[PDB]
Structures are given as C-alpha cells and as structure tokens.
Amino acid sequence: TAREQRIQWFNHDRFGMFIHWGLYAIPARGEWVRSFERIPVEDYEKYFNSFNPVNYDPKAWAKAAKAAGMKYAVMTTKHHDGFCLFDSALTDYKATNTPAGRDLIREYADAFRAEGLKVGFYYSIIDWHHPDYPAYGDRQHPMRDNAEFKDRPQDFNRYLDYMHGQVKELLTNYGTIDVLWFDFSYEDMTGEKWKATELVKMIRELQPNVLIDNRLGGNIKAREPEIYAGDFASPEQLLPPHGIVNEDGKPLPWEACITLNHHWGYHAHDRDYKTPKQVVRGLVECVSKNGNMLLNVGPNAKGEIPQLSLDVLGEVGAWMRANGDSIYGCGAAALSKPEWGRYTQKGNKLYAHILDRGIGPIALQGLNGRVKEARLLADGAEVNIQTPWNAVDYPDYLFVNIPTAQLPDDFNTVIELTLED
Amino acid sequence: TAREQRIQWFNHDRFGMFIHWGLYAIPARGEWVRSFERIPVEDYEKYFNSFNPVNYDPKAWAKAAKAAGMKYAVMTTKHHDGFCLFDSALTDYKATNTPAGRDLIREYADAFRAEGLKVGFYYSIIDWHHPDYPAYGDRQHPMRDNAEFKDRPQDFNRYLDYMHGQVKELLTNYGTIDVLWFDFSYEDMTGEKWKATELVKMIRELQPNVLIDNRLGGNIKAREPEIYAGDFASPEQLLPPHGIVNEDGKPLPWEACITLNHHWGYHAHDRDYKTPKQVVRGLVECVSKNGNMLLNVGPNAKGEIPQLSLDVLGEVGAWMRANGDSIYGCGAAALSKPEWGRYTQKGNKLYAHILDRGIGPIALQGLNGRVKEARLLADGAEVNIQTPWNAVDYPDYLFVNIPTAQLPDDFNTVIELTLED
Amino acid sequence: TAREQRIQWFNHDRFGMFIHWGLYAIPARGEWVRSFERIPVEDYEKYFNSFNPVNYDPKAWAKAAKAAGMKYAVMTTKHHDGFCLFDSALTDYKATNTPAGRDLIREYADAFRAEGLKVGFYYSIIDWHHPDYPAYGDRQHPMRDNAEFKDRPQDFNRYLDYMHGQVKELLTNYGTIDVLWFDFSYEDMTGEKWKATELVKMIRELQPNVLIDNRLGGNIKAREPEIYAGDFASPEQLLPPHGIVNEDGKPLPWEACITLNHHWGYHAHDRDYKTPKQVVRGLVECVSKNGNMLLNVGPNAKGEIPQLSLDVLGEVGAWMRANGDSIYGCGAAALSKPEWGRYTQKGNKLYAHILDRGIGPIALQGLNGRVKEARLLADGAEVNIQTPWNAVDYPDYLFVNIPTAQLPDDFNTVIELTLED
Numbered sequence A, B, C: 001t002a003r004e005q006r007i008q009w010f011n012h013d014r015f016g017m018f019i020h021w022g023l024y025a026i027p028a029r030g031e032w033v034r035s036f037e038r039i040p041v042e043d044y045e046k047y048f049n050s051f052n053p054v055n056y057d058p059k060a061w062a063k064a065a066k067a068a069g070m071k072y073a074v075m076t077t078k079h080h081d082g083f084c085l086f087d088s089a090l091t092d093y094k095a096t097n098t099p100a101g102r103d104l105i106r107e108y109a110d111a112f113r114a115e116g117l118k119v120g121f122y123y124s125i126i127d128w129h130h131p132d133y134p135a136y137g138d139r140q141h142p143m144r145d146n147a148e149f150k151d152r153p154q155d156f157n158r159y160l161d162y163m164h165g166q167v168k169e170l171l172t173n174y175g176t177i178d179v180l181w182f183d184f185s186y187e188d189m190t191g192e193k194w195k196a197t198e199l200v201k202m203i204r205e206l207q208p209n210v211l212i213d214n215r216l217g218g219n220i221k222a223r224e225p226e227i228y229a230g231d232f233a234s235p236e237q238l239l240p241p242h243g244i245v246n247e248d249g250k251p252l253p254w255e256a257c258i259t260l261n262h263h264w265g266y267h268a269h270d271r272d273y274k275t276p277k278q279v280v281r282g283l284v285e286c287v288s289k290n291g292n293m294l295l296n297v298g299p300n301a302k303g304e305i306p307q308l309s310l311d312v313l314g315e316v317g318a319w320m321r322a323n324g325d326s327i328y329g330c331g332a333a334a335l336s337k338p339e340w341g342r343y344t345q346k347g348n349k350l351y352a353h354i355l356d357r358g359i360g361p362i363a364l365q366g367l368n369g370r371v372k373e374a375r376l377l378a379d380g381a382e383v384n385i386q387t388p389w390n391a392v393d394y395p396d397y398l399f400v401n402i403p404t405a406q407l408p409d410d411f412n413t414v415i416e417l418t419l420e421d
C-alpha cells in the first residue's frame, strides 16, 4: 500500500525534465569524457577552476519546464566525475569551491519547488574522483588502464560511507525530495556491494515517500523483489515495445529517459535535435504503454538551456496546453495498437491519437457501438462517427469522418471517445 | 488460369491514374451537377456549345503520369451525363461535334500507349442523355422528380443496344485496351438488367485479356461468381482496413479509386489537396494489403491537369524513382502491421516502410535471426541491424539503428530486408 | 620546359572534380571501412556481389561538372580496398565481374572527354586485397592485427608487377590521360619501395604529358626533386595559409583536395555539406595563392551524385558563369591580403574579391594612382573609385564606393581593376 501510495503522483504526472550539468559542460563533448579520454584528476582541474555559470537561472529553467507541460525534474547532484554541484560537508570537490561560489543544487530545488514541479536528484554511485573507488581494471574508470593505480591501497568502505553520507545530506538539507535517481550498477558493482539494503533503509527513515529508480541492483520484475530494486524501471534511449511488467504480468511503473539531441551533458557541436512532433509522439507512446518520459536538457557551461532545446520545449508545451488530458492521469487501453496511431485511456475516456490521417475515414476496429460521444480534445468540437456510405462493408469498425484532406494538428490530433457503460 | 493470367500485369503494376474529364469541367462543380441541380438537357447544351479545350495535350498528361510512377490510366469515355469524348457512330452528343472537333479518347489512347502506360477506358452504364434510359422515378436521373417526364416513350432495349454498341466501338476502334471500368449498378439496375452476361461474352470475344471492375452487379466474393462479376474489386474514397478477400478468405485483386482533392471532375474552388506524403502512404498501404491505387485528376475545361495536381504528382514521382521496387511487383507480408509503419514483400525481399522514426532503434518483431542483409532502398546504403547495448532485454526483436534524429525521407524511408533461406 | 609546358593547362584551369566511388558506397560509411572495422575480404564480398548501379550515368556527371565551372576530373580507378572499376586483365576483383558487368572507368573517360574536360585517374598504390601487399603489422591494413596473417609467405615484387601493369593498362587502354593521382606513401612504403623511378619512366614513355601528384614519396619542395616527386603538391582538407613554395621560395603547382561533406566515399548519414558560398570562397582563396582546388563528390551505390552535392555544384556554376574570368588563368597578386577580401590577378587585370562589404567606402591600400578603370565583373558596370569627402585623410588608399548597404553578390562581389602599365 505504501509502495502504491507514493508512486501515484508519478504515474499521474507522466512527463519530466532530466537535467545533466557539471564540469563536463566545459569540455562540451559528453559527461563520459574523463573515461573515454582517460583524463586524470589533475588535468580535469582546469574545468573545476574555470567553472563560472554566470547565466545560471534555474527559475527560467523551471518556467520553461512548466510551460512545456512537464511536472517533475531530476537534476544531476553529482555525476560519474565526482564533482558535487551541492554544498557537501564531506568533500572540497564541489561548486562552492569553484568560481560559481554557491550551492547550485539549492537554487535548482527552490526554483522548481516554487513552480509546483516535483524535485528529483540524480546521484552517481560511480565516482571517478574519490580515491577509494576502484580504478585499475574497472569497466570505465578513467585510470582503468594506468598501471600506476594497480594495487594502490584502497578502502572501498570509506567510499561507501562517503556515498551514504552524501545521500543523507541530499535528503536532509533540501526539503522534500520526490525522486532519487541512482546510476548505475554493473558487473560486481551491484546490490550489497553498495550496502544497498542499508542505503534504502536510511533513505526511507529520512523521506519514506521518495521514489528510487532500479539501478542499485536487484530485480524490479521479481514478485518479491529486494528492498533496493526500485519503485520504477528506467529504460534508456528507447521506448519499450510493450509496457514493462513484472513476472506475474503486473504493470510496473517505468520511465524512458531520452536525450533531446544525442547527448546528456552539453555537446557544443550536436545540433541534431528531435522535433517537438517526435517529442509529443514519444510521450504519447510511453503513456500508451503505462509509462513516463524523462526528457533531458544539457545546459552549457554558462548555465543556459540551449536555445534549440527551449524552442522544442515551447512547441511541445503548446500541444500540451490543448491535449494534456490525454497524457496526465492516463494509461494504456486494453486494445491493440491501431493502424492510424495510439490509444491512451483514463476511466471511460479513451483517447484516439491520430498520428496518420490516411485517406478517407479512419477505421477504429472493435469499437462499433461502444462509443457514446466523440469530441476533438483540442477544441471540444463534435466528431462525426456515423459509418459513411463507402464503408458499409466493414461493420466490425467504428468510423471517424474528417472532412479535411489534412488533420487540424500534424503532431497528433486527439479524439476523446466517451465509452458506453 | 485464364482469370489469373490476365490480372498479372495489374497486380504487378499497382499504381494508376484516373481521369475524369468532359462537359462538366465547365460548370466546374462536379460531374453529378445535372443530377443534383436537376438540369434538363437543353440547359446543359451551353456547355456542349462552348467546349473547346485550348490546351489539351494528352502527351503532357502521359508524361506527368509516367513521371509520377503510374503504370496505367483509366479515362472517362462517357460519364453519367452521356456525353461521349470518343467519336461514336451511335450518337451526335460527342466531342467531334463540339467546337473541339476531336476524338479526345483516340488522342488519350495513343499518347498513353506511346509512353508505355496501359490504356483503360471508363464507361458509364448510367446515361442521363439517352431518351430510353429511365428518368422519372430513377434514384438519380436529373428528371426523376419532373412529372412532365412520367410516361415518356421508352424502349430500354434501345439503350442496351446503344450501350453494348459503344463498348463494341471502344474495343474495336482504339487498339489494345487493358481496363474497362463500368459504373455503376444500383437497385434493380443491376446484373441481367444490363444483359451483363451477353456484354461480357461480347467483351471477351473482342479482347479476352481486358480487365473489368465489379460494378455490373454480381458478387466477386462468391466462390464461383457470375461471368460479369469482375476481375477486380473497387473500394472508393477509402483504403480498406484489410485486404479484400472472397467468402473462403482467398485474396481478390482490388483497387482503391481516390481523388487528389475532394472531387472527380474539376472543381474550380476545391484546393483542399492531399499531400504527396499522403499519396505515397496511401499507395504503400494498398500494396501492403494486396491492392492497387488509382488516383484521379480532373482536368479543367481547357484540357489542363491543374497545377496543384501536377505538383503533387511530381513529388510522388521523385519518391517512386528512389523507392518503386517496394511497390511494383509487391504485396502483403504475412506479418502484423508494425508500430512504426508497414511491410510490403516480393519473394525474399521484405520492405520495411518506416513512417514514424519514433525514438531510439526501430524494433522489428519476429525477425531476429531471419534477416541476412538490410539496405536503404533509396541509395543502396547498408543499415546496421545489430542489437544496440540498450535493447538486449528484447531478444525476439530485430533492431534497425538510425544514427540521425530524423529519417532521411519524411514521406517514407524504406528498408530493403533480404530474408534468409 | 617539359615540366613547365605540360602543367600550363592545370594552372590555367584551377577547378576540378574529385570522384570517389566503389564498393564502399554500399556500406556507405567511408572508403576506409575495411581498415577501421578490420573487415576480411570474405565479408566485403557481399558488396562485390550486390554492386549493380541502376543509375550510373557519367554523361550526367560530366554535365554537372562542366556546368559548375569545373575543367577536369579525377576518378578512383582503384582505391585502398583493391577493387578495380576498370576491366583489368590482371585481376578478377573488378567491376566487369560484378552484376554491373561494366567498365565504369571507360564510360567515365568517354563521358568527361566528350564534354571537353581533362580526364584524371586516381590509383591507390595501397592494396588491401592483393595477397602480396604487406598486411600483418602494416599501419592500416584490415588484417594488420590478425595473427593468422603473421609470417605467411609473400613476394612484394608480385604486387609491384601487378601495380606497374595496372598503371600501364590505364595509360594504354583509355586514350589520353591528363592526370595520374597516386595515393599514398607512408612510413617505409615510400619512394623506391614502389620502384617509383621505374614507374615514372614507364609512365612518361607512354604518356609524357601526364601530370602526376606528389604521393609516391620524395620531396617536391627540394631544389633537386627526385624524378618521382611529382608535378604538383596535394594539401588535403585544408587551404594552406600561403601558396606552396619549394626550398628556394619558388611557387610550386598545388591543388587542395576538399570534400563537399566530411567524407570522400558516399556516407549515407553525412549531410553536413559546405555551402556554395564557402566553395566559391575556397576556390578564390586557392587561386589567390597560386593553387587549384579539386572538389570531391562521393556517388551512392546506385551511381548517383547525391542531390545535395548537385545543389551546391549548380549554385557554384551560376557564380562562375558571371565571375569565372577572375579564376581561370589567374594567380596571386604581389599584395598582402586586404581586410575586405582577396586579390587574384591575370596580366594587368587585378580582381578584387569583396568578401566583406564592411561599412562605408572600401579601402584598397597601395593602389591609389595605380588603377585606370574599375568594373563589376558580373554586369560590366563602372565602380566609382574617387576618394569620398569623408576619406581625404587617407591618401595611401584607393576607395571603392558602393552606394548600397549590401553587396550585389553575397558569395563574393568581384571588381575588375585595370592596372596602369
């Protein structure tokens, strides 16, 4: 019941902003740059010492997210590079010791909270800076192939204490936190290796309603999962072909995390953006399969969401002002996907998402005499659903009649169907 | 055997041009105008007297059609209004007696034959001009409610001699004809009322290989149908939700006849055209369901294919030049329609028609291990069909990786999959 | 004087087309694909077996080239992968044994020569197919790291027979060849390893006027260049900061070879194309430094120059139609590069290439009293070169006055200045 209760807002809200920001925004080629260029800590220091986000305005970020129709955010407090954007009492490697001279995470949390957005923190359990985190031979440590680190003396338990402490700070010093998005478990760096059981007990004594993703280890699909296996699953850079279900076939909460371009952190030459049309359609696809979408922005080193990112969000937002009822509080319908688009549903309201006008009337299989009313969501206008003369040979189908050659909305034209009961 | 042999070219070719043209291009408000405005013959004579197409160049027409990827054409030799565009020996109400002084059908037939298109003739079995065709009480004769025409002299046998005679002329005086498209039976005006059996015996005596539509009455869906039931079915202003089959579920040749705007004949104020994207996706749909598409143009009173119609056809043609292998000679795959578009197939070539890029790799159900090569049809380029890292939880899918945020072709990006065996 | 005489056409003509085509158009991610993916010959065979360009029309290629203002071409007869596009008697790995069954180089040579363009052949002295070319341990051979190839029996002399044979075929079987573009020498695979002296002596017995590039090894900048050092230098994917000179500071003939996108071979997802404006400016820059530009196209597997390449070439051509006098037969002026653009020169015609209108009148340092007439090259109109009232304090300058805020031509507005003798 507690599990079911704390996840309600999340399932209802459907659409979030991911935010990846850090020192990596200066090299501006990806958050993994220490790893793929094997950059030791001394060489990353020039980014630490020059990080000065003079145009950082998270109230403008939050207004952008809200206007986009997003209901929650998740921001990187510390990525794999170990740099804390928050004012930790446990390290010096944090934004308050850069020219930023401030807690960037407090500004984020206050701005998003004040717009009515739920406040999420991302926290990398990987740490390429902490000297006790394993390095020589690790799958992706920057110094994984540097023999100067082989058999260097380490106590992983100190890293864990550090990590457990930082999580405590995040859940004590920033008000109410709706999501903790850990990242990620791999090979033997999974489960109890993090003291995950203990981590999660501590978390639920501090903020019992917080939602955790499924990256600490374990198996969220098990009927009786471990305590750290997560409240929701997190497919990445794809939309599952089917909603994610557990081993009994029960729907699990899930959220697809998706980049706007191809990159999480700011990438100075990646302008290969998704269109607002694809963003809308992906959100609708996630909802149509009982899931959420977490759409990422990577702000530049000056602390700006890139203009192309904002242009996309503004148009998505225009669509959501008209069509949001078919997203918020909605889920999958018990019908196969139709030829012409997708369905989402909320009680006795079945939303037909017309992605492809086709030619002539639109055929909704299995719904003849199950629909009491049909209305265009965007304007509340009646849609004619009488079988036209040229379609009388197809009585298993309901027909929607659109008298224009093109749809009124090319992103997605939504028809609200009120089902008989 | 005879039935299968003669339809082969038609099933192969898939894509043709309907041409509605005649006196009704002057009132320019639809070919039913006499009917719906109850115009007597004397009032419509003004169109007969002023019909003089200054710019009728059926060689231009044929080049536009060929360029569009159309393989065949069907032109109106006489419509419901009874005006004949060919030089009939059986009436004076023909194009050679207008100021045009030409046999427009001869010109059409020659010009299209010259470009290598198959030549089809449409003949209205309804006639609102012939004195022996039923008028008073008719479902749609112009004079149906004019009681001054109740009890007018009538020998319907003379209309049948006229009709059977004109079809004999079309099939003797104009070389090899590939399609005869009759239109249409209604109420008691059906089947043997037309002497359909003697008509078709006459037709097959003269040109045994001609294809006939299914509007003479009859039931083409019957296990052994009437001899006049037709070679192909003719759904209209809709693309059937499923391919047309007979009672046993055997697939029938069929063809969807579709307007470019809302009108068959030229409508001077109808600029609500389908886009080239829509046309390409309509044809693909038809082929995916074992069917043809016959797309209409309605020339204006001067003999011109309207410029908006030529614009559409020009772009359709650019697509067909790159992608016609996925159309010509193809039909249905034995696979459900996939989420992202549609399949068409030819031997071991399965064509994936990507109509929505979605987000992430494109998931093809049931095809892992079943595909040997994948290539973009438009340029011959190799496509990567390796399961990406973020998709390993879905082993019953084949994944197509597209490295750009948008498809190369927004109409329809086609992927030629070479199947194993 | 042999050397000077045969290079004059090259220096005069300035602008050429590079064409990279072969089996690598299919995998469509660069001609180095065997090397960067360590592909063995057996897995590349799928491309040999499916190579059948449906739309290879080198007459169309040549018209495109001619209309761009290009005067010569150079085409890959055989790239690093060893596949020959010409009907060699010395190998079976050639285009007449693919489904194409064509000598692609013969058609190229005939098409270009008929349009009046000089005909160039590019030939890779590197060969990743020939069994005697060094593989294990080679800098870039596909099997360079494959243990199976270590210490297998090889005789490099057989590769030199093959290669010298193939060069003799190119120079005997295809008429007059104006350019031979060899590629490339590296580490120990340089100079007399190729038997380059014998190669060049043979070349010059067969076609004494052929121009050769500088990639067989040795030093074209030397005072005493080897016989195989070349007639022209070949900087790549940049425009050198100053014209190429030898050790005595004498100008050498040079050509910058430049891709239209980022790739030589066809790349199916690289649309990052240079604009016509950059193409013009780069040609101008090359000429302004006494060099040539060789601009590359990478045709697709069907043998089409990509649409986007053709768009750039046609807009370049339109500029060359008006302004080509400032390119052909032109070279460097003895002046520093001006603030507003660049100079080219031909006899007493000094062409000022206005790349940047600035604000107000344009200052040409050092030319006050040295210019008789000024004309706009495109329309032959006069240009006012009187010192304006607001510019009398600057008498070491000639001023060009443009009465409009913007230039007539944004690519480059060329003023022809006739010099006082």
Ligand SMILES: OC[C@H]1O[C@H](O[C@H]2[C@H](O)[C@@H](O)[C@@H](O)O[C@@H]2CO)[C@H](O)[C@@H](O)[C@@H]1O
Pocket (backbone or CB within 6 Å): B049, B050, B051, B052, B053, B054, B099
């Ligand atoms: O092709 C000759 C002629 O055709 C049309 O002329 C019409 C005219 O507009 C009507 O008012 C009436 O007189 O019938 C004519 C046809 O005989 C075109 O309008 C005209 O441009 C053209 O010369």
Ligand SMILES: OC[C@H]1O[C@H](O[C@H]2[C@H](O)[C@@H](O)[C@@H](O)O[C@@H]2CO)[C@H](O)[C@@H](O)[C@@H]1O
Pocket (backbone or CB within 6 Å): B325, B329, B346, B347, B348, B349
């Ligand atoms: O199925 C193997 C087949 O591939 C090619 O056939 C093409 C044909 O060239 C096109 O005109 C169109 O019909 O699509 C076909 C399927 O790809 C080869 O040309 C042919 O040799 C081979 O049998």
Ligand SMILES: OC[C@H]1O[C@H](O[C@H]2[C@H](O)[C@@H](O)[C@@H](O)O[C@@H]2CO)[C@H](O)[C@@H](O)[C@@H]1O
Pocket (backbone or CB within 6 Å): B325, B375, B377, B380, B416, B418, C049, C050, C051, C052, C053, C054, C055, C099
């Ligand atoms: O020009 C002949 C033919 O070439 C291409 O056919 C390819 C086909 O796409 C591949 O799957 C494989 O079968 O090799 C064929 C060539 O041998 C074009 O795709 C096709 O349109 C064309 O007719």
Ligand SMILES: OC[C@H]1O[C@H](O)[C@H](O)[C@@H](O)[C@@H]1O
Pocket (backbone or CB within 6 Å): A020, A031, A032, A183, A184, A236, A257, A264
């Ligand atoms: O979900 C996106 C996250 O996971 C990615 O796979 C990387 O670890 C990190 O760059 C990012 O924060």
Ligand SMILES: OC[C@H]1O[C@H](O)[C@H](O)[C@@H](O)[C@@H]1O
Pocket (backbone or CB within 6 Å): B020, B031, B032, B183, B184, B236, B257, B264
């Ligand atoms: O196929 C379209 C045909 O049928 C239509 O229903 C009408 O009879 C006529 O306008 C047209 O020729």
Ligand SMILES: OC[C@H]1O[C@H](O)[C@H](O)[C@@H](O)[C@@H]1O
Pocket (backbone or CB within 6 Å): C020, C031, C032, C183, C184, C236, C257, C264, C265
């Ligand atoms: O000049 C360009 C040539 O050199 C390039 O560096 C590659 O070797 C080859 O793709 C090309 O033919």
Ligand code: NA
Pocket (backbone or CB within 6 Å): none
């Ligand atoms: Na209207």
Ligand code: NA
Pocket (backbone or CB within 6 Å): none
């Ligand atoms: Na790229």
